[PDB]
Amino acid sequence: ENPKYLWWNHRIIPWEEATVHLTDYWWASVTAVFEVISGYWNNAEGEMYIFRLEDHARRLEQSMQLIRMPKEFTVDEICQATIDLVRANDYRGDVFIMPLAYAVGGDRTTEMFIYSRPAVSRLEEDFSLHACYSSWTRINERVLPPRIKALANYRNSQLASSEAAMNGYDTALFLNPEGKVAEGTGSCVFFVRKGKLITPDITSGILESITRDTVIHLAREVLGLEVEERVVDRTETYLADEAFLCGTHAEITPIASIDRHEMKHGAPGPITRQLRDIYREVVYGRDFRYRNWLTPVGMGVR
Amino acid sequence: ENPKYLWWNHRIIPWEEATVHLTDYWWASVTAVFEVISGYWNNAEGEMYIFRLEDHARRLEQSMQLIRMPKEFTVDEICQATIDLVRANDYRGDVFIMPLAYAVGGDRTTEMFIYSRPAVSRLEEDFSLHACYSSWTRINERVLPPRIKALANYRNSQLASSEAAMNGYDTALFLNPEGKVAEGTGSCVFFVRKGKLITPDITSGILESITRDTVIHLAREVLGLEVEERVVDRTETYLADEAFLCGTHAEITPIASIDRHEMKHGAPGPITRQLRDIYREVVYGRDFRYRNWLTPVGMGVR
Amino acid sequence: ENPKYLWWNHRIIPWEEATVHLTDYWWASVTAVFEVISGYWNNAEGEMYIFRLEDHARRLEQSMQLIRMPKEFTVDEICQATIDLVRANDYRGDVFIMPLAYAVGGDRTTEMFIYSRPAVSRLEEDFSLHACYSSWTRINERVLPPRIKALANYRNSQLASSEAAMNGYDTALFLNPEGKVAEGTGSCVFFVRKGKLITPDITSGILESITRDTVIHLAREVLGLEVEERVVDRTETYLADEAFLCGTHAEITPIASIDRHEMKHGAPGPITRQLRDIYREVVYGRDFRYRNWLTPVGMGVR
Amino acid sequence: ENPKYLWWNHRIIPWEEATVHLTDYWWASVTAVFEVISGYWNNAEGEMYIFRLEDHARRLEQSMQLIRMPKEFTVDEICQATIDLVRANDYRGDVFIMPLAYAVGGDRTTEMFIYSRPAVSRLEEDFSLHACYSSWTRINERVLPPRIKALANYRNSQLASSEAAMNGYDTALFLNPEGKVAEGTGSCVFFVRKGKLITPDITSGILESITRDTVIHLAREVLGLEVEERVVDRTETYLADEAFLCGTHAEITPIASIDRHEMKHGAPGPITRQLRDIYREVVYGRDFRYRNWLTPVGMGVR
Amino acid sequence: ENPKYLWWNHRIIPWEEATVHLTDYWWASVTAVFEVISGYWNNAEGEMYIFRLEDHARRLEQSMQLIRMPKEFTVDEICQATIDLVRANDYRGDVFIMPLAYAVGGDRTTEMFIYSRPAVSRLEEDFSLHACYSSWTRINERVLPPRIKALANYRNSQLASSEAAMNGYDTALFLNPEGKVAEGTGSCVFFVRKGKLITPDITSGILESITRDTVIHLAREVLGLEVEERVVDRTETYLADEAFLCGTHAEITPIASIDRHEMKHGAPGPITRQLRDIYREVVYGRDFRYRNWLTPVGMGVR
Amino acid sequence: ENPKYLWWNHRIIPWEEATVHLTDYWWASVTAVFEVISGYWNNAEGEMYIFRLEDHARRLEQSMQLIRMPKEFTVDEICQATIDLVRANDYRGDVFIMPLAYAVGGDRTTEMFIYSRPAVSRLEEDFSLHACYSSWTRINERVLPPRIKALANYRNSQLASSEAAMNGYDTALFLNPEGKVAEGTGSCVFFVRKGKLITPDITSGILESITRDTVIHLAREVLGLEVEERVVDRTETYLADEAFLCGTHAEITPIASIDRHEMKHGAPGPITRQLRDIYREVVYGRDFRYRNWLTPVGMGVR
Ligand SMILES: *Cc1c(COP(=O)(O)O)cnc(C)c1O
Ligand SMILES: *Cc1c(COP(=O)(O)O)cnc(C)c1O
Ligand SMILES: *Cc1c(COP(=O)(O)O)cnc(C)c1O
Ligand SMILES: *Cc1c(COP(=O)(O)O)cnc(C)c1O
Ligand SMILES: *Cc1c(COP(=O)(O)O)cnc(C)c1O
Ligand SMILES: *Cc1c(COP(=O)(O)O)cnc(C)c1O
Ligand code: NA
Ligand code: NA
Ligand code: NA
Ligand code: NA
Ligand code: NA
Ligand code: NA
User: Fold this and answer.
1) Do D9 and D105 sit in the same domain of this protein?
2) Is residue C134 domain-shared with residue C280, that is, in the same domain?
């Protein structure tokens, strides 16, 4: 069942009006940048909570500025479009909102659509992925800034992901050109060793993850954990007590193993279970301390 | 004015029937590979000549195999689709045919369309581009095989191309991760110094260019020129007597200068003028020696 | 109008006595190291203030030790030579003092001259440079230690600087062999984002800048600013609220833009305006807190 | 005893008139490029033979073009200046001629001098050097094109040369950034293994040596030797039957050993002895086959 | 059943006399170099044929010279030791002979043993391996010369080999630090595409394989095949018509696939079947053209 | 005089029973990992103190897990084996204990021996080494994780060590692939500049040194010193006030110089003398603050 609506170039339109030609936009897709924004439905409150909407909208405006898309949309327009579309679609459950900006062909024009679709959350569930390091190297600033969340950056993140599946793993992790740990294919990665949390620093060649930012805040401020952002080596992650992938799509995804070295305290391990549960209570609006991360959209009870 | 038809998933359909949803295929575009195939119209013969159709169709099948698209189309189907579409569209002039293959979401499905549109040839004309080397590095086998003609590989080739335009040049050339000359943004590059032709070897990190292959054949076999495929240094190209970009879209594009070092014998220089003219007579079907490169489509005089 | 004097090999001599043969010292210039030392004239006090003379003289002795020039001069001799020459020249305005050490040809001999010339300060003025990243890579420890302030290190810093001018920019910034931000051509670079100050760490492959050291002190101790010395990525600097070049010659030079991405809070931006003004009051001897950085030379009012 | 004359900026002048200020030209020396040209005195013929004068003069014009020195001198002017100065100096023995071009400070001016001094030839003598590989890496196209014979490129070639002397060797050889054999500090290197001659290819990151060019011609055309220009590994050179350094200053310099691995057939080994003797007979004008490499300057018997 | 004898430090001794302490030689094993030499038993002739004994013995002396083991053994001693041991052991079938040299601890002493054990040949059999590229990078000249056949070089070649087995492949192939194809874990690799044979050049960072040398000779001289020794890219090998591993242990080992891309003409493919059969007839002494590669040891019929 | 006993595969046995065949274990030695554990004899207390036994035993279990040796031994077994062997050998002086684990050949078996031998301590003595940087590059995570204390990792650490000796130095220091300071050949390195202690961070590509860990603790907690773990450049170490190598074998080894640049405050310098003396009092059991690092083995007075 399609959403009722989507937003396209400054306006909400019924889903079925947004038809284009098969041959529109394949060249535009080379330039395209996107965000993935979560909405979490609190049936008790009859409110959707859109997680860090403004951070996502600012990350998009920056990705657009680095692609050098001419100015057409604002942060406030993308935030309001997302609010308006989640209300108008009238779906009272968890959603993914996806803004996607693209430049169409000298005088390129900037366009964008936003669509919101139902999403499955796994923050109640206890599951684990078996990860491998890819024989494929992560994109770097020299060739393809990981900082831009460009569709093209995912060509790199399907060399790794299809390798991982055909060799019997659930997920790929990347090494950077210099042999250091980069990120997952769609997400940042965390390692627990002791109860010290470890994650690659930004200049390891990764996206400016809002989830990574969120986890680091929650780990330091709720749990009092030490969190190291640093150059991380492959072999030390094999020795991790726990590991997880985090991102908007990934929420908190435990890693059971890495190149078949098994995380000592399981998956989800204790620090992972804690961070997963705190995350969940934040995003569903049952933690008043983190309220400023949440954009409510009142829609009335399901 | 749109073409009458296009080919999509094993069938020709009127142009206007190929409508999809705005939100179809943005994830598929990450995987997408394409060819650009030239058709040259000989009004004297009333035939379109499709240049090296089978090489293009085989390059596409290989690009698809390296992306790991499941098998759905054959070389012979792509060659025949292109013949059939150029006839059915009933346009008696120069065309670009563009097959584009993409995988749609475990059990991914392989899809492809082909569309043929009128094209402007510049093989009569004498023009020249001012080129710069980009401060952006070419994609390599470690991160994004240049060998695959993937839409995503063009994200790299618009870092360079937009830099080139905003800094007052017509076109970008690339250096590889190791500092050696790679290719243009959409084309291979040739240098003339003496009347020795020079072009980067394939493992410099370039596409397996059919035009590059064609030029090397024509330079050796018609002109008796020495042609070096080797590691090429930046500074020596500044000292080139001539330079040109070559590809299907680019045909033979003379470079007047490179980072404002001007090619000594102009643009097009003498060896460039020769190769341009021989190319033109080959592709338009007025050189019986190269006939096996040509797929005629008889359509009757314009 | 030439200075009255200069210092050469342990002695002050009239300017016109320091004549050599056209063919002396071109081989010596390969080895040569130098400092640029500022003197700031306070007409109210009738004193020249020589900025961080001993740091400059120690940096020179170290540059000499790393070149492996045999010992001939001392730190104290270079400090006193600079004091004596600024007095003897009897010029009551802002000056640049330039010690230059060189080895002359087994048993190489160490020589040095120091000359002081009038200098224009721009610390009253509000101006801005448009910067590009160079397609040329910074020298590293593997080939040419950036730590040594050798004339030869400037061959690298005129690949970048002449590129920048011919492509319509005022100044070049460098990327290191690994693609990270290095420095300007003659100066260290600072970025303001938030009001967090950011500058590459030393092992990014930069000179041990006294101005950079000075700015970091002034930013932390006068302004209470956070200052990050770290690996800095190209794309984040495009997103900078402000940027500036700093060095002895450069003082504080605001950057309006970088590869045509414009710094959000202008040039000079607010944190830049503050640091410029504090710097100025320090170097001119109107800030008693920083007095230990200043070597007064009393000469009587202009 | 000084030469009678030198050439400076389009004119011959007595040696003693070419006096400048100690402080002229230290910044210009960063830009400076030079050639070293040999003159060989044949007392039997009363002629100096200037070796490959035009190649040297063209290499200089190219080095100048790559530095981007504005045009001021011609190839023919440098060739004639060198002829005229060797006649006017009236020294009837072996000489080194050294053109040195430099740009003086927006609107930079191009200047050049040429001076000719007596030189000791070692082509009668049988001597050998003990070489080490340097822990310092050769300059590459990314940072400092080895192709430009710039004074600054010798800062790199005194990291290696002073290391070599203090660790008990006569001479340094370089490895490139990728770990492959580059060149000596002032010369190209040849290895003999079998009686196959081996030397790094140009894009190993070396100067376009006229001596290297000369040796390769003489090895192929007089001796019928196989000569490989290719990527050369460190360890294989340890296993060389012979090795030598060649250049204008170096003529043919045998290497007895490399990191204390001794060349099997000694120094000079047999192929080295042959090439040394053929070189000598070429440069002294007693080999009519190579006459086109020689510019005679008749001056009458010593 | 143990061999009757082995050779150790210049003498043949019964197998059971060669007992040492558990704690002897673990430090020596860091330095150790070895060869693997094949003996092929021709029961018709009652002769063992030892394949390219002198090449193997010279490769060992070179490996020893590069490790800097003091001189103790000669090429002729290793050749004769191997002859004598294969006779004295009195085993009339295919054997592996393994010389292993090691330095024991200032004044290190050089030691060596040689032992010959029965070996299974697979040159009658038609079998195939499924290969992966390793996420582990091959050792290079910078860190560990692949040219030395050192036991330590196999630590690298069990990162790859254990990865390959746990991820469901039969064998690992390596990429070099620069992302190009290096070798297998114990063998060189060949690709057939067309009927052009392709194999990495030596400076791709590989061992000087005698089998690789043998195959290239046999391919050119018996089959008239084109054989390219060059930089080889990962993706092109996926497109290979055939592939094989070759070495002393490996003989000719067909590769059915590489990262699950299947070689078009199977395994063994036609050119592979030919080269396998020619190899077999060479090593068993039924090809008089290649007799100079064979060291017969007459022992009388089995 | 041999020890009375050693431990092998879960049991203590007389020294003379541990005899194997010359040809056992040369392939196993490729996989082998080891620790070096110090025992310090306090004749006053009649106790051996085994330094950080559990850290060493855990480092071994991790090295074994990363090699992928099947589980056979425990941490507690290695700790108890070492205690038991030092008692049973009945030697009342300083010892080195060396566990060495190895896998013997599909279904590899894990084996280990431990042997304890008398050791000379140099912690009373004042001596100094002259160090060079090696022209050989340190092993990295890409090829050979420095994190694993594998015998094979020492092949790299005898390229450097034999270079150092033949070029007149006492010891080699390494640069990493990126040109930064790695470690010594068998030890971590510390630099003193000011009285700030500096040592490369782990991801510089070094072993997880227990001695390095110990020194950093003692420097911070006893001396209140600042200790920087960071990327360290070659040239800054030349400017060090002091330097030392530290490890189990090396204890605290002062460096007098580095590529003949002499440490300003001598060797051992003051901070080095302090750390040496504190280390000594810790390991000999005369510092109750560090008692938890010590495993006593009471044996009665010598
Ligand atoms: C989006 C993304 C992430 C996670 O970022 P969030 O802002 O938390 O969604 C990680 N890696 C890649 C490659 C991404 O594109
Ligand atoms: C297609 C392409 C070329 C030229 O190849 P042709 O087969 O001659 O069209 C060159 N460079 C790039 C990046 C390409 O994609
Ligand atoms: C001198 C210099 C600087 C600035 O250092 P100061 O001590 O502040 O003058 C920056 N970059 C380079 C390349 C320099 O030579
Ligand atoms: C000049 C030079 C050579 C040799 O070139 P010739 O033209 O034969 O003198 C080799 N190496 C370097 C670095 C040089 O500058
Ligand atoms: C020995 C070896 C080979 C093959 O060499 P042969 O002389 O043919 O046995 C290939 N790779 C490695 C790593 C080797 O050690
Ligand atoms: C063991 C070792 C060290 C020092 O580690 P400790 O645990 O202090 O003995 C340093 N470098 C290397 C290469 C080592 O193997
Ligand atoms: Na609203
Ligand atoms: Na047809
Ligand atoms: Na004074
Ligand atoms: Na004349
Ligand atoms: Na015999
Ligand atoms: Na006990």
Assistant:
1) yes
2) yes
